[PDB]
C-alpha cells in the first residue's frame, strides 16, 4: 500500500468529509430536507437526520466514519448538534484548503481555526448561561422540546413527550450530579400506539402479562416472587434435547410437572409473594395449575430483565427455586397489564413509587420509523433537556451566534499577529454555513439571509432575533424559540475543529489510495 | 530460480530503496511534527507519530527498509522517543553521496570516515552534557516537574501541564523501580468535564459486572480481599454433554436445579475464598450476580486482565487459576476498595494496594478526536522524565547542538581535508535536517533560524537551540528543552552505521526470486 | 542445460561466470570485504564477503560458473581463504583469452600458455615463501596467522577474533598436532556484544536445559531425538484425548511413564539426557523430580554436533542406551557462554575435537559475520598443521611471479607467449581485488609495485591509508598467508578455468 | 503596498460593517489588495504570507 | 500428409548431416578439445569422444537417427 502526504493526503481528507456534509446540510434543521436511503437489503430509510444518516451511512473514506462517531458523542450529552458539527467540519475543511493553497502550512491552518474556536465557545458563553431547577427548566425545556422533538418532526401537540423528559433525567440522575444517565432512563416505544401516546414510567413495564386475567390482574404492593426457575423448558444447558413420540411417555410426563409446578406455585404462594416473576416463565400446563392455584404470576421473563426488575424496583433478589425463602419479595407498586387505550399495546408496568432505579419513558406511534422518529425525538429532546435541566444555558440558533461568534473571532483574529490571523479569521468565515444551509433549508438566499443576522448582530450582538429556522416568516431565534444549549455549541465547535485538527494534524496517509476504512 | 543484482544499479537501488521509507516519518515527530494515519489493512487503520510502530505496521519491501527498522527502533527502546529522526539521518547522507554514486566515485571510506565523525559528536555530546539531578534544586522532583512541564509541552497540552507536571513526577516515582506503561496505565474518562486528569496511585478498574440490583449490592470494601480471578460463571454450569432425554419425566427438573447448583459451588468457592470484592476477567453471570447480589459480596465480570494485573503488581497479588483463594498474595488485597463513578461509569478503585506501584490516571479530553494527543504528553513526559532520571547528564533538547556540531564538524572540513572535507561537510550538515524538518514541518524557516543559532554557534554557544512551539532561535536547555546526552548519542550511532551498512552493499541476492 | 549455441559458452558464458564471480571478491576480498546482501529461500539478509557462501547463496544459472564455483569452495575446504581468489583470479584468467579469440588464438593452443605457467607459478611459489611460523599451541602466532583469511572474509573485528579464533583451535586441542576438520563447533548465541563472544570447548546446548545439575563434573548422556513427551518403546506411550478423564489419567501414568524413561537412561547412567524430541509436563517435572538434566528442544544440529563428540547416537525411540547409545563428556555444566545461561558440556581431555566459541552480537549478522570469519581461522589452523610455511598476504605475492611470468612469457614464445603473459596478468587482480575493495587503482599500484619493484612485502591492503594507494608489508603486517593456500589457490583456479576454457556449446535432444 | 495593507484590513471590517448580501463582497474586494505587496514582498524575497499577516496587524 | 521431394528431400538430410557434423570439429585428436554436452541431468560433460555426445543430447533430426 501507498504513502499519501501533504496536499495529496489533504485532498484525500477533503472529499467525503466535505461531501458528506452536503446531504446533512440539506438535511440541516427541520427545513432540512429528508433523504430516502435504501440498503442492499431492500430497506428504505427516509432520513433528514445526519446522526441517522451517518448510522445509515456505510460509505468509505474513514473520516466519513469518524463523523458517524462524532455525532454520537454530542448525540447523547448535548442531544441536537449531531449534524451541524459534521457540516461545520466540511465548512472549515474547504476553508482550510485555500490557506494551504495560500501556502499557510497544514499545522498553521488547524490551530488558527482552533484558538479562534476558543473565542467562539468563549463568545458562546455570552448568550444565556442560566441554571434552573427541573420545574422551572421545563418551560425552557419544552420551548426547546418544541425545537428538539420538533426538529425531530412533531413535537407538535406534545408536552407529553416534552415533560416526561423533564422527569426522565431528573429521576434517574440528580440536577447537580450531571452524571449522564440516559442509560437509567428507559426510552421505550411501541408501534401501534400514537405519537399522542407517550408515557413516563419511573419503574419497568414488562410486556409479558398475567398468565390468565382470570387470575388476579392486580398483585398488591411488592410481594413479587423473584424466580429463575422453569415453568416451561428452561433451555437447560445439559442434555440432548428430544421430545417423546409415544403415548406411554406422553402419560408418564403429564402427571410429573403437574405435581411440581403446582407445589412450585404453591411454594410461591408459600413464599408469600402473590406475583411470581419467572426468569424461565410459564407454559400453559403450569398456568392451568397457576390458574388452579389462583396465584397471580408472570410468564416468560427476559433473563436480565428480572434483574432489571430487581434494581429498577429496588427489588431484593430471590435467585432460584432452590434458594426459596418467604423473606425476599420483589418490589412492585402495582402489578397489572397496561392497555393505554392501545390494547394491542399491553405491558405489565412494575410501577415504583418507592424504589425506582430505571425510569421508563414510554412513547408510542403508528409505525416503526414513527416511534423511531418519536424515540429520537424523545431521545435528543431529553438530551438537550438534560443539559438545560442541569445547566440551562441557551444559545439561540440559526446562525445568530455564528455571526456573533464570527464577529469577535474575526477582529480578534486580526488582533493576533500570528500567521493564524488569517486562519483565525478564516475560521470565523466557515461559521456562516450554519445560517447558510439553514437559509437554503428554509429556502432563503443565505448570503443576504445571514448578514441580516449580521446586521442584527451588528446591532443586537447576541442571538435573540435571527433568521427563520422554522421558515415561519418571523426572523427570530429567541422569539422564534430557537433555543440551543450553550453547552452544545461549545461541544459542537470543539468537536468539529479538533477532529478536523487531527485530520489536519494527520497529513500522513498510508493507504492503497486517498481514502479507506 | 534465484535472483541477484550488483553495483550502481543495485547500489543506487540500494540507496533508492532506503530514501523512500524515511519520508514516512519525515514531517512527523513533534507538536507541529506531523502525525501518520497509516492504513495497512482494509478495516485496519493505524495512527502513530512514531516510526517504530508504523515501521512495525508498514511493510518492508527492501533490505534497506528491513535494515532501517531496528535502526530507528534502536532509538525507540532507549528513550521511548526518536525513531523518526534516526530514520531521517540514515538516508540523509544517501542523497549527499548520490553525487558520488553518480560520479560512480566510492572508495568505501565514505562510510568509514563518517564513523570517527560519529565519534567526535557522541564524545562531544556527553562532554557538554550536564547532570540535571544533583544540579537542580536539592530536590530533583521539581527538576522532574521541569522536565514534566517541558516534556508535557512538546506534543499537546501545555495548559494542563501546570497541573499535570507535578503528577508526572509522582507517577515516575512509583513507575521507577519498575518501568511500565501498565503502572502509569491511564483510565480515560469523559463527560464529567472536558480536558483534565488526576493521578490515582493505587489501581483502578474500568470494568465490572453487577445486576439483580447494584445500588443494593455493596460497591465498596474498606478492607477488600481482592480475588484476581480469570474464572467464568455462566447462566447454568455444565460438566456433561448428554446422557438421556429441553422435556422426560424425572429427567426435566433433574438437570435444571443442579445446573443451578454447579454454579453455586463456584458461586460459593468465590465467596468463601475471601472474595468480597470479586474480580473475574470472564464475566460473572446474571443468575450468578443474582446470587452475587444475593450474597452481597461485590463481584466483577468482564474484567480487564491488566486491571487484574495492575492490582497483582500493586497488591503484590496474583491472578488466580482457582475460585478458592488460599493466599492473600495469590489473592489481591487492599485496605480500600470502592466502586465510585468518576464521570459516571462504574469503576473499581484500589487504594491500599500494599505495593501500589501502579499509578492510574483519570483523564478527560476536549472531544472524541482530541483526546489521544493529550495523554501522549503525559506518556512522553514520564518516559523522558524517567529518561531525565536514568541519564542525569542532560543537554539542550530540540537539536541545539547539531548546528554547533555541524559547524564544529565541517570545521574539520577545514581541518580534516586532504579529501574528506566533503565527507566532513556532508556529515556536518545532515545533523541539522531533523530539527530543520521540525522547523519545516512547522511550516517555518530553519536556515533563517538555525543559522541565527549558528551565528551564535559562531559565538561558541552550543545549547543555543529552537523551541519547536515558538519556532525561533533560543537556548533549548535555557528553555530547558531536554534530552540526556545518550539520546543524541545513540540516534547518530544508530543511523550512522545504517548510513554505513548497505553502502558496503552493492549487491543483494534473492534465492526466492521476486 | 543450454540448447544455446553459436560459439557462446566460450566468448560469453565464461566471462559471465567471472561477472558472477567478480565483485564477490574484488570488493569482498582483502583486509576486509564489502558487504553482499543475500536472501535465501530462507528469507533473511545475508552479508557475505566469503566466496564460498555467497556463491552457494546464489544458485548457478550457468554451466560455466557451475564448474569454478567449486574451485573456490574447495579452496575453503583446502585452505579457508584464496576462495575470493578463485573468484577474481580464475575470473581474471579466461577473460584475458577472450582477446586471444579475437586475437585469433585458439583454445587448445592458449591453454598450454596457461597450463605450463601454474607449474612455473608452483615453481616460483616456494621462492617468495617468506620465513614460516608454526606452534599449534600458539594463540598469538596463529592469531596473526588466522588474520589474513578472516580479513578477506570478515569486515568484523580482525584482531579480537584472531584472539578468539586462534584461542579455541589451539585451546580445544591444547596439544593439537592432531586437528579435526571440525575441531570447533561454535555455539552461536545472540545477545550482548560480538566481544562478549568467547571461547569454550566441548559441547554446548544453547537449547532449553532443564532438570538440574546433579553432576557438573560427570557428564553422561544418552543422546536422543526421542520425545519424552511420552514417546517410549519400553512401554507403549499412548495419549488418550477421547475423553478429558482419559487425558488426566495418562498424565498420572505419565509420571510412572517418565519413571520408565529418564530413569531407564540414567539406569545406564546419565546426567544430561540429550532430548532432541519433546517432553510433556508430567514427564518434565518428573525428570525434574528425577533430577536428571533435560536439555530440551535440541535440534538436529546440536545433536549432530554432540553425536560426534561423545560417540553416542540420537534415538527417536526411548530405550536404555547401550554402550554405543550412551555418551560421556568430560563435564556438563551450566555456564553463561558469552554471558548467556545455557548448558555447556566439556570435551577436551574427552579427546575434545569440539570447541564451542559462543558467537555473539545483538544481531545474527554480528554472529554470522564472525561465523564467516572463525572457520577461516579454524581452516588455517590445519593449513598451519600442514605447512608451517608463511607466504605474505595477498597482493604483494602476485607481482613477483607475474614479472617473472612475464619474462617467462618472454622466454616462452610461440603463440602461447602472451598466453603465458596473460597468466602473468591474472596475478595483479588480487591486489586490485584489494585496491578495488579499497577504491584505488592497481595500475598505480602496479606502477608502484614495479616502481618499489620488490615483490612480496609490497602491497596495499584495505585501508583508510588507501585514500592514496599506500603499500604495506604483508608478511610484516600480521597478514600471513601460506604456501599451500596460495599453492591451493593457484591450482584450482588454474585447474578449473583452463578446463572450462576447453568447453564447447551444448547440443540438446 | 502598506496603503492597501492598512486599508484592505480596514475595508474588510467595514465591508463586514455593511452586512447585507454584499458585505462579503468588499471584504474579498479589500482582501484582494494585500496580496499585491505580498508578491512585491516576495519579489524582495522573504515571506509576505508571514509578513503580510503582520504588516496587516 | 507432407512429402519432401527431390533436392528438398535431400537438403535437410545432408543439411542436418554435415552441419551438426561440422559442430563437432573442436575435437578428434589431442589438438581437438573437449565438447560440452549437458544432458537432461544437468550433468557437465566435456568430451572429445564422438560416440558419447551423439546419444546423450542431440538437436532433433531424422538424421540424428
UniProtKB/Swiss-Prot annotation, chain A:
It is found in: Cytoplasm; Cytoplasm, Cytoskeleton, Microtubule organizing center, Centrosome. Coiled coil: none annotated. One of its GO terms (cellular component) is chaperonin-containing T-complex. One of its GO terms (molecular function) is beta-tubulin binding. The keyword Hydrolase applies. Keywords: Acetylation, ATP-binding, Chaperone, Cytoplasm, Cytoskeleton, Disease variant, Hydrolase, Isopeptide bond, Neuropathy, Nucleotide-binding, Phosphoprotein, Ubl conjugation. Transmembrane segments: none annotated. InterPro entries: Chap_CCT_epsi (IPR012718), Chaperone_TCP-1 (IPR017998), Chaperonin_TCP-1_CS (IPR002194), Cpn60/GroEL/TCP-1 (IPR002423), GroEL-like_apical_dom_sf (IPR027409), GROEL-like_equatorial_sf (IPR027413), TCP-1-like_intermed_sf (IPR027410), TCP-1_chaperonin (IPR053374). Its main location: cytoplasm. ADP binds at residues 29, 81-83, 151, 398, 468, 484, 489. It comes from the Eukaryota. It is an enzyme of class 3 (hydrolase). ATP binds at residues 29, 82-83, 398. The modification Phosphoserine is found at residues 2, 322, 515. One of its GO terms (biological process) is chaperone-mediated protein folding. Belongs to the TCP-1 chaperonin family. Component of the chaperonin-containing T-complex (TRiC), a molecular chaperone complex that assists the folding of actin, tubulin and other proteins upon ATP hydrolysis. The TRiC complex mediates the folding of WRAP53/TCAB1, thereby regulating telomere maintenance. As part of the TRiC complex may play a role in the assembly of BBSome, a complex involved in ciliogenesis regulating transports vesicles to the cilia. This is T-complex protein 1 subunit epsilon.
From Swiss-Prot, chain B:
GO terms for molecular function: ATP binding; ATP hydrolysis activity; ATP-dependent protein folding chaperone; identical protein binding; protein folding chaperone; unfolded protein binding. There is a cross-link at residue 419 (Glycyl lysine isopeptide (Lys-Gly) (interchain with G-Cter in SUMO2)). Pfam families: Cpn60_TCP1 (PF00118). PROSITE patterns: TCP1_1, TCP1_2, TCP1_3. GO terms for cellular component: cell body; chaperonin-containing T-complex; cytoplasm; cytosol; extracellular exosome; microtubule. It catalyses: ATP + H2O = ADP + phosphate + H(+). It is an enzyme of class 3 (hydrolase). The modification N6-acetyllysine is found at residues 56, 239, 309. ATP binds at residues 30, 82, 85, 387, 398, 488. Mg(2+) binds at residue 81. Its EC number is 3.6.1.-. It is found in: Cytoplasm. Gene3D superfamilies: GroEL, GroEL-like equatorial domain, TCP-1-like chaperonin intermediate domain. Belongs to the TCP-1 chaperonin family. Component of the chaperonin-containing T-complex (TRiC), a molecular chaperone complex that assists the folding of actin, tubulin and other proteins upon ATP hydrolysis. The TRiC complex mediates the folding of WRAP53/TCAB1, thereby regulating telomere maintenance. This is T-complex protein 1 subunit eta. It comes from Homo sapiens.
UniProtKB/Swiss-Prot annotation, chain D:
The modification Phosphoserine is found at residue 19. It comes from the Eukaryota. It is found in: Cytoplasm; Melanosome; Cytoplasm, Cytoskeleton, Microtubule organizing center, Centrosome; Cytoplasm, Cytoskeleton, Cilium basal body. Belongs to the TCP-1 chaperonin family. Component of the chaperonin-containing T-complex (TRiC), a hexadecamer composed of two identical back-to-back stacked rings enclosing a protein folding chamber. Each ring is made up of eight different subunits: TCP1/CCT1, CCT2, CCT3, CCT4, CCT5, CCT6A/CCT6, CCT7, CCT8. Interacts with PACRG. Interacts with DNAAF4. Interacts with DLEC1. It is linked to De novo genetic variants in nearly every subunit of the TRiC complex, including CCT4, have been found in individuals with a broad spectrum of brain malformations, and clinical phenotypes ranging from mild to severe epilepsy, developmental delay, intellectual disability, ataxia, and other features of cerebral malfunction. This is T-complex protein 1 subunit delta. The gene is CCT4. The chain holds residues 426 to 482 of 539 of the full protein.
Curated annotation (Swiss-Prot), chain E:
ATP binds at residue 29. It is found in: Cytoplasm. It comes from the Eukaryota. ADP binds at residue 29. Component of the chaperonin-containing T-complex (TRiC), a hexadecamer composed of two identical back-to-back stacked rings enclosing a protein folding chamber. Each ring is made up of eight different subunits: TCP1/CCT1, CCT2, CCT3, CCT4, CCT5, CCT6A/CCT6, CCT7, CCT8. Interacts with PACRG. Component of the chaperonin-containing T-complex (TRiC), a molecular chaperone complex that assists the folding of actin, tubulin and other proteins upon ATP hydrolysis. The TRiC complex mediates the folding of WRAP53/TCAB1, thereby regulating telomere maintenance. It is linked to De novo genetic variants in nearly every subunit of the TRiC complex, including CCT6A, have been found in individuals with a broad spectrum of brain malformations, and clinical phenotypes ranging from mild to severe epilepsy, developmental delay, intellectual disability, ataxia, and other features of cerebral malfunction. Belongs to the TCP-1 chaperonin family. This is T-complex protein 1 subunit zeta. It comes from Homo sapiens. The chain holds residues 11 to 75 of 531 of the full protein.
